[PDB]
Write a protein that binds this ligand. Sequence first.
Ligand SMILES: Nc1ncnc2c1ncn2[C@@H]1O[C@H](COP(=O)(O)OP(=O)(O)OP(O)(O)=S)[C@@H](O)[C@H]1O
Lengths: 61, 55
Amino acid sequence: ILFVDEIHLLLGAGKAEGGTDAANLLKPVLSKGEIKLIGATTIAEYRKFIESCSAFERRFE
Amino acid sequence: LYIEQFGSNMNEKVRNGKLQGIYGRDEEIRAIIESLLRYNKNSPVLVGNPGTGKT
Ligand SMILES: Nc1ncnc2c1ncn2[C@@H]1O[C@H](COP(=O)(O)OP(=O)(O)OP(O)(O)=S)[C@@H](O)[C@H]1O
């Protein structure tokens, strides 16, 4: 079971060479029900994920 | 002869039966295949509204 304090620290921040960024993996993985994470974000800041690339919108819930 | 696992294999996973039986848009499938047999251009791209099936 995976937990994330702030998903902004994964996608809003983060070098490509320092770990997961907006350009790393888990994008075509989270179509499948292989990996089970539990995140926590706030609404008006979660609107940055929609306007970022509009691709995590249908991968997270 | 090649290792072939630099990305991931796609045929052998459906040979295992994990992804059998896909309901199909047959006009969409043949749009790929006719782009696949050309002498000059051999690269289709499934541009689409992000919700739909691409994979
Ligand atoms: N024609 C279809 N028949 C059955 N399930 C489908 C079909 N098209 C999509 N799905 C379902 O869609 C989910 C995966 O999302 P998809 O949109 O197919 O992935 P995608 O087309 O690559 O979109 P992205 O690029 O991942 S945002 C899975 O639960 C599939 O079962």
